[PDB]
Ligand binder design. Structure first.
Ligand code: HEC
Length: 125
């Protein structure tokens, strides 16, 4: 869907940005600093879940640029793995949310977060 590499870059960064917001916004709740409303959380996770599938398609060959390390392309299999483990954690998050269990959510939240970090460690400049 992209004409220039710059456009894929702009797209993926935007998706990542949005996702960061949707995920990050739950930290105070998960930490107990904000009240917990199951329904609100559930809806937010639904959005997050949609957003989380988006970025991956904008890292095709020829989209080199931004803060993407070249290893994303040299080591595609490793990148796919990182991405899949991440989506899997999203699924867990989603299940915790659906169930309305703060403990579960809290734990899953940590798992997801570690997933973000794992990817960044190997593939983000
Ligand atoms: C690999 C599969 C990743 C996972 C999982 C997550 N992120 Fe990441 N992120 C990744 C890369 C390769 C990049 C650089 C993209 C580029 O082309 O510049 C990023 C970047 C971000 C950003 C910056 C967006 C911007 O404004 O430029 C943010 C805010 C970000 N990542 C956050 C983020 C969060 C919160 C994640 C988990 C919920 C997460 N990322 C996972 C690679 C990967």
């Amino acid at each position: 869907q992209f004409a220039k590499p710059e456009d894929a870059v702009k797209y993926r960064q935007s998706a990542l940005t949005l996702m960061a917001s949707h995920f990050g916004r739950m930290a105070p709740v998960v930490k107990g600093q904000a009240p917990y409303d199951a329904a609100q959380i559930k809806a937010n996770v639904e959005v997050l879940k949609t957003l989380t599938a988006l970025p991956w398609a904008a890292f095709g060959a020829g989209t080199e640029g931004g803060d993407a390390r070249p290893e994303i392309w040299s080591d595609a299999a490793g990148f796919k793995q990182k991405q899949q483990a991440f989506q899997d954690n999203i699924v867990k998050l989603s299940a915790a949310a659906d169930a309305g269990d703060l403990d579960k959510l809290r734990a899953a939240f940590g798992d997801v977060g570690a997933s973000c970090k794992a990817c960044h460690d190997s593939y983000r400049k």
